[PDB]
CSV table of C-alpha atoms (C1' of nucleotides) in Angstrom, one decimal:
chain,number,residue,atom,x,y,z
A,1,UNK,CA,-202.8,-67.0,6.0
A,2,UNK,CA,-201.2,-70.2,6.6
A,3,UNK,CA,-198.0,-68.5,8.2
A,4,UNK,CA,-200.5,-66.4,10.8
A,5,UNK,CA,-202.2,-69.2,11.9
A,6,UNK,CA,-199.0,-70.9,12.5
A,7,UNK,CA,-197.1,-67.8,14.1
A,8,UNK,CA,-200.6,-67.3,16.0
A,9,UNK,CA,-200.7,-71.5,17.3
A,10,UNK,CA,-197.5,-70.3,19.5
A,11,UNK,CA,-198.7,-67.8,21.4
A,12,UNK,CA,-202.3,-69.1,22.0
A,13,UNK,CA,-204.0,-72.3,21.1
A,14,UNK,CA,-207.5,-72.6,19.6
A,15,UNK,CA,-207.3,-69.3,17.7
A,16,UNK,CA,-210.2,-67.9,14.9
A,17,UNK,CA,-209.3,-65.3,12.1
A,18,UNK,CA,-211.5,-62.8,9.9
A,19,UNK,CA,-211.1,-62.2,6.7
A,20,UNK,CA,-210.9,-58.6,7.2
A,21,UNK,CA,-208.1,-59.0,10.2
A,22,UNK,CA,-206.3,-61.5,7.5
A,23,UNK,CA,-206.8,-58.1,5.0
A,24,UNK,CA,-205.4,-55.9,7.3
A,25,UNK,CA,-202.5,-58.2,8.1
A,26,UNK,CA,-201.8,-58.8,4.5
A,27,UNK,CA,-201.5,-54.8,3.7
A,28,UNK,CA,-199.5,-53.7,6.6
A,29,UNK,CA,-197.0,-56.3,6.2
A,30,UNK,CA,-196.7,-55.7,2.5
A,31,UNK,CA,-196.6,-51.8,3.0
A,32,UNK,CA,-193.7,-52.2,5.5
A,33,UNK,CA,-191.8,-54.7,3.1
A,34,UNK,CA,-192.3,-52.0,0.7
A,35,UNK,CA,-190.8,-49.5,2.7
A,36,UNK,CA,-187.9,-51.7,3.7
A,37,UNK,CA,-187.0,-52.5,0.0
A,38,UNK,CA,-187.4,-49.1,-0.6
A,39,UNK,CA,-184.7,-48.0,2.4
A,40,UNK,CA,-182.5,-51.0,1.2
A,41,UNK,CA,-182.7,-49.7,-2.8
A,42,UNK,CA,-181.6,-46.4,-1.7
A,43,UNK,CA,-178.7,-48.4,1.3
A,44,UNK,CA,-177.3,-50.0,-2.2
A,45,UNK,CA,-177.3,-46.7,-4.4
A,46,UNK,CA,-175.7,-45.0,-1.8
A,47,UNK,CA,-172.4,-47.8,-1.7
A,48,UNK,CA,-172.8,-47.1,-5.5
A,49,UNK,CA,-174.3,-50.3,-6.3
A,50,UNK,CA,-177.1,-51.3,-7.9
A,51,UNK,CA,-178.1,-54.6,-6.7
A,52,UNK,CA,-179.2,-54.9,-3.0
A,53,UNK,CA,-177.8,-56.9,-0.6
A,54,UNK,CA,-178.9,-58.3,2.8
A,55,UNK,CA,-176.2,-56.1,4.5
A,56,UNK,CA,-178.4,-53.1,3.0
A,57,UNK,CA,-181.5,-54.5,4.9
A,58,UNK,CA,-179.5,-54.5,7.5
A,59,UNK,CA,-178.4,-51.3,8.2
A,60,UNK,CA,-181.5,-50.0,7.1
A,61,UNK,CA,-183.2,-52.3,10.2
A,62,UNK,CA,-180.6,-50.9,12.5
A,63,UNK,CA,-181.0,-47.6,11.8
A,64,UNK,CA,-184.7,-47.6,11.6
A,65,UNK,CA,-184.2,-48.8,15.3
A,66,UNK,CA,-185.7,-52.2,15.0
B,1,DA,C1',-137.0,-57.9,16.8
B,2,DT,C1',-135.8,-53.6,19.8
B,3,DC,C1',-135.6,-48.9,22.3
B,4,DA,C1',-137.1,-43.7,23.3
B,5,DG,C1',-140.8,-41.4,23.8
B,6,DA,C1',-144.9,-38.8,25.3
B,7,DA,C1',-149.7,-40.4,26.9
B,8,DT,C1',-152.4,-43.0,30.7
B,9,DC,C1',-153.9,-45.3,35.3
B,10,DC,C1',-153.4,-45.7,40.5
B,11,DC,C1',-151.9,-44.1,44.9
B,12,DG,C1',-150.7,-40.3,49.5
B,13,DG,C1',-154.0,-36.4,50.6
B,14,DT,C1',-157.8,-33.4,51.5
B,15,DG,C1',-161.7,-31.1,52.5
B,16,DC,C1',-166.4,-29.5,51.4
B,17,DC,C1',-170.8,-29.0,49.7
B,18,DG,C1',-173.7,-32.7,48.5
B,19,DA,C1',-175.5,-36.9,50.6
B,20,DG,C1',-177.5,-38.7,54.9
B,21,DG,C1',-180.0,-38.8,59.6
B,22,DC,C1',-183.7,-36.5,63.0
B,23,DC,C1',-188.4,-33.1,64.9
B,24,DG,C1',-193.2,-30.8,64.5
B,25,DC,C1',-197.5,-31.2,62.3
B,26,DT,C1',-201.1,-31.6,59.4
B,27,DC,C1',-203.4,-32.8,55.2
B,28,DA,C1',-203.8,-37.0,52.9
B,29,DA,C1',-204.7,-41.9,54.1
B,30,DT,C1',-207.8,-45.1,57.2
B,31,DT,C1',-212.1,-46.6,59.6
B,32,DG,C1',-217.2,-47.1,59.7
B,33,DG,C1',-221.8,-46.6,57.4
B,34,DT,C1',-225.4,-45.8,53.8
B,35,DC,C1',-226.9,-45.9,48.4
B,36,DG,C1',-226.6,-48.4,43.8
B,37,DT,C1',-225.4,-49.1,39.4
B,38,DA,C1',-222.1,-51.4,36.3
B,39,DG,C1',-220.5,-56.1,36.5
B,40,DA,C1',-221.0,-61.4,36.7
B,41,DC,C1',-224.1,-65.3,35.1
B,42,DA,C1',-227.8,-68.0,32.5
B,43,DG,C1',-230.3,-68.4,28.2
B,44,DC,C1',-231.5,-68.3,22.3
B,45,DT,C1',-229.8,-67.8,18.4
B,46,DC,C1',-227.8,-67.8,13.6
B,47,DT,C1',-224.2,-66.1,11.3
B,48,DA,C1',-219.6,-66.6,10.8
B,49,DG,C1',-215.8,-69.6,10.7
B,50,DC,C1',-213.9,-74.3,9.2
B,51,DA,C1',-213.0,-78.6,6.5
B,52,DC,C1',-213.4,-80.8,1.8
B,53,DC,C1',-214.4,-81.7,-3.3
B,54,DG,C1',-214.6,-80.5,-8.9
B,55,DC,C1',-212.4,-78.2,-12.6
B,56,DT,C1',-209.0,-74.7,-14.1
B,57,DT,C1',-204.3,-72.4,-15.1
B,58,DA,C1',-200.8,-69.0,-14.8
B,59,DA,C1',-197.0,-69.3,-11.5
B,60,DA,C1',-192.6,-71.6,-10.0
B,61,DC,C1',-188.6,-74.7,-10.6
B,62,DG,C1',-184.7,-77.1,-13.6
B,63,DC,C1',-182.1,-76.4,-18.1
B,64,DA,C1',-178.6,-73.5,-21.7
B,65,DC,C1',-175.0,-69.8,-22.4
B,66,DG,C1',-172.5,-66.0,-21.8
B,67,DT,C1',-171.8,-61.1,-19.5
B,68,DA,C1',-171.7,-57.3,-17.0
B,69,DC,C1',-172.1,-55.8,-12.7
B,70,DG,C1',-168.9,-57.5,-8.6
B,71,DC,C1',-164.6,-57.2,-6.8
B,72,DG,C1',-159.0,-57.4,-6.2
B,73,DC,C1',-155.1,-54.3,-7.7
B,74,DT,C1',-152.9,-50.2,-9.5
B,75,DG,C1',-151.4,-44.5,-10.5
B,76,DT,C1',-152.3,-40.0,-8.4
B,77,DC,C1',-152.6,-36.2,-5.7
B,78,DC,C1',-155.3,-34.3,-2.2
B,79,DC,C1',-157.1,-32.4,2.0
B,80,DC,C1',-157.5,-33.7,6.2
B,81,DC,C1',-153.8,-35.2,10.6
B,82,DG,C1',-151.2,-32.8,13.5
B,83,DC,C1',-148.0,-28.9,15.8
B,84,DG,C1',-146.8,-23.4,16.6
B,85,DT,C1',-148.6,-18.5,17.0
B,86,DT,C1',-152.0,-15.2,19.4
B,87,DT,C1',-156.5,-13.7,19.3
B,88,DT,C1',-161.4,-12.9,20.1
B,89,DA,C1',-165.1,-14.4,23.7
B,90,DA,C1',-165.3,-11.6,27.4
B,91,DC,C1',-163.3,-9.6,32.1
B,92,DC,C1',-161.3,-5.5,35.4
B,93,DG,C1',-157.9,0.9,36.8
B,94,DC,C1',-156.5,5.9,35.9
B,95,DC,C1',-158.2,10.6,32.7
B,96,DA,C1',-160.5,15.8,32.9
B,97,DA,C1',-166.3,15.9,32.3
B,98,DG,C1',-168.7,19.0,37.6
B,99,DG,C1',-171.3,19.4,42.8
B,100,DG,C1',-169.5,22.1,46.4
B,101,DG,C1',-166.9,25.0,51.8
B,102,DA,C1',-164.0,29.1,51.4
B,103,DT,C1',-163.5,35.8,50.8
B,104,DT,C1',-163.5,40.6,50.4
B,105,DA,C1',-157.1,42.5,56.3
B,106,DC,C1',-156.9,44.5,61.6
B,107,DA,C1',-159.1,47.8,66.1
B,108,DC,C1',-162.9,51.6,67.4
B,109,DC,C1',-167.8,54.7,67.1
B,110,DC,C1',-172.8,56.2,65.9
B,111,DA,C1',-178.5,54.7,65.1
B,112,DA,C1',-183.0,51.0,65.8
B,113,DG,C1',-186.0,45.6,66.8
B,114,DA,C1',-187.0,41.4,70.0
DNA sequence: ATCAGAATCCCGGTGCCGAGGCCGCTCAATTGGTCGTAGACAGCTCTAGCACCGCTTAAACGCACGTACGCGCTGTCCCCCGCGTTTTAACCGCCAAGGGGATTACACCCAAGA
């Protein structure tokens, strides 16, 4: 919560959060760091390794297109 | 270090079908006027958001030691890297299947209708 109030300060000032919002936040950012460990576990077994490594995020960011 | 070699870019050169300029309307855009409801503004509110304290505790960081996943280097033989030959994806002229004019010689005579 403290991070989206802070990432939320720059782009407007005086800013109110719900709970609910805060909820929703919370899931969707967890669900899509789930998916990226997911696409870097599989990056790392494919280059027949087993630990992952940021160059695994990596390509899976760049190939996911973001 | 140094050269011979096939592969690549820019220049005369050219013309032609795509890019570019012009004419007539006419159907969409503009003007003017009459309804009129969804939008802008003021007011009450209380719930929802915000800041802070009391007490609690499992989570997070520093320590100890080695190891096994991480990574450089080696032996192999492999299956793509690359050239030479036509060929398979279609593109391009003469056979032996029939539809038709032509004939039944030459000259003469008789009979009977429009």
């Amino acid at each position: 919560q403290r991070l989206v109030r802070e990432i939320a300060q720059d782009f407007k000032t005086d800013l109110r959060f719900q709970s609910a919002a805060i909820g929703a936040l919370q899931e969707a950012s967890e669900a899509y760091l789930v998916g990226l460990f997911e696409d870097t576990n599989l990056c790392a077994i494919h280059a027949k390794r087993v630990t992952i490594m940021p160059k695994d995020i990596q390509l899976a960011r760049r190939i996911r297109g973001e």
